């Protein structure tokens with residue numbers, strides 16, 4: 001029993017983190033095989049941040065402008081290239097701790113673990129969701145750029161996020177590992193703001209099922225509803241609309257609890273219209289939307305990895 | 307003078323198109339160096355479309371299950387792998403017509419050219435925009451899967467789209483060239499629908515500038531406005547909000563016409579509230595939103611390629 005904000009074990013990622021220094025700027029890199037990946041704004045100085053011309057800035061650099069350290073060992077940079085907003089540093093030594101990996105781009109609503117790092121050294125691990133406005137609500141201080149987000153599928157690390165910047169509202173923006181930003185953000189210091197966020201409805205439903213599994217049942221009721229009647233109320237409270245595909249994803253959780261999805265939607269409808277009335281669900285006084293159906297199954301049924 | 311829906315010259319892409327057959331299914335592939343890229347649903351039969359398990363389906367295939375033809379020449383498949391929703395077919399011969407290329411992911415509102423193909427043979431070229439709901443309004447018939455979208459930057463082809471499917475409303479969905487879908491779509495036959503589309507405001511403004519450059523001035527007026535007052539009206543008509551970054555992008559067009567962006571916004575505000583009154587702009591009776599500021603500069607000032 002129990003329900004916690006649970007991250008993936010980070011061991012397989014910790015061994016890939018390195019420190020990258022260019023000039024007086026130091027941030028984190030990801031060392032896989034003989035390539036080190038890091039944000040390209042490592043090559044920017046103060047004069048360049050407002051309107052960087054990255055092709056120009058990179059052409060004026062040589063391999064010896066890049067200092068790469070893995071703990072004590074310094075890695076010799078023998079080549080460099082740019083792929084979108086990510087810099088790829090070819091090094092002379094392939095990381096012997098390279099796990100089986102792949103680069104995947106995630107969708108809004110999906111969760112992943114973040115290994116926050118400073119000076120190439122892992123500092124902490126936490127779980128977060130990609131928000132519908134393509135930001136994450138992370139926890140990052142100065143020096144954290146190049147920290148990565150990941151999921152673990154069996155033996156395979158799926159890298160999905162590299163951290164680039166903090167926006168004025170205190171939320172965070174970055175790229176996939178091919179250097180393509182999540183959301184309409186750019187790596188220059190301009191006045192960019194995240195759009196309107198919404199609540200991830202399929203995730204709230206998954207969390208309500210987790211509550212039932214753990215003995216929280218006070219919000220249930222006898223009624224049922226239709227997708228269209230529910231979505232009519234959800235849009236009024238800035239909730240993402242619910243699809244038939246969402247209903248199918250929640251299948252394993254309705255089966256385990258014997259509570260139909262549209263039955264559970266009727267409870268959610270009541271909670272949206274009446275509030276919590278000072279009661280809590282799984283130790284929270286708000287509706288939580290950063291657990292996917294898969295996260296709930298993983299934690300309430302059991303799945304491990306290497 | 308003049309203003310047309312103008313696509314990029316397609317020659318450099320036509321020489322990369324091949325035909326891929328697996329079983330009784332034939333679609334188009336992109337042949338760059340010694341790799342052929344194509345949609346992975348080429349390995350699906352009728353029984354698999356509802357719930358494909360692509361890892362299973364691919365493990366039961368061998369290299370000789372894949373027939374690749376470039377015109378008459380058959381290409382020998384010596385290896386195969388899957389990257390997200392794209393299949394990568396290693397072949398024995400590197401395409402001697404491989405141009406300088408890169409794989410880029412585009413943002414909503416950006417435009418690109420589509421080379422529609424059938425049986426590996428180019429059929430037509432047209433220009434379209436990635437909509438805010440991550441679909442495109444293309445023109446595609448049966449057999450068009452694997453057709454690609456591209457931009458040309460100087461000598462370099464930037465591939466940004468591969469066609470996978472048509473949605474029930476008649477709009478189109480696909481991936482970038484790393485196999486990651488644009489939008490929340492999946493390559494299985496389920497009931498997926500595009501979300502609400504909006505009008506790309508910065509593109510409408512660019513088009514109004516193109517009109518002024520070409521002698522259409524009847525919609526102009528003396529007033530001016532602020533971003534917040536304009537965005538207040540725009541959101542009421544399902545227009546994307548306008549940012550300061552958008553204002554900066556439009557800079558070259560305000561300079562050439564001597565009409566400030568916020569001046570032009572006041573004209574747009576009037577057109578939204580009063581309509582066209584039976585008059586046309588650049589031969590259209592509707593506000594066009596599929597020309598970026600860059601497209602207008604390219605066509606109204608002049609830029610060519612190799």
Ligand SMILES: O=C(c1cc(=O)[nH]c(=O)[nH]1)N1CCN(c2ccc(C(F)(F)F)c(Cl)c2)CC1
Nearest residue numbers: 041044049140141142143144165166187188189
């Ligand atoms: O390390 C942090 C940090 C991260 C965080 O999440 N929170 C926090 O407080 N600090 N930095 C802030 C972002 N920064 C940066 C440098 C250059 C550029 C560019 F592209 F314009 F050249 C940009 Cl866009 C950002 C590097 C330093």
Ligand SMILES: O=C(c1cc(=O)[nH]c(=O)[nH]1)N1CCN(c2ccc(C(F)(F)F)c(Cl)c2)CC1
Nearest residue numbers: 347350355446447448449450471472493494495
């Ligand atoms: O060629 C066209 C076509 C394209 C178009 O844009 N318009 C049009 O009319 N036809 N096809 C329709 C899509 N199709 C397909 C096959 C398998 C799957 C999957 F993933 F489930 F296995 C899917 Cl999702 C789609 C292949 C054939």
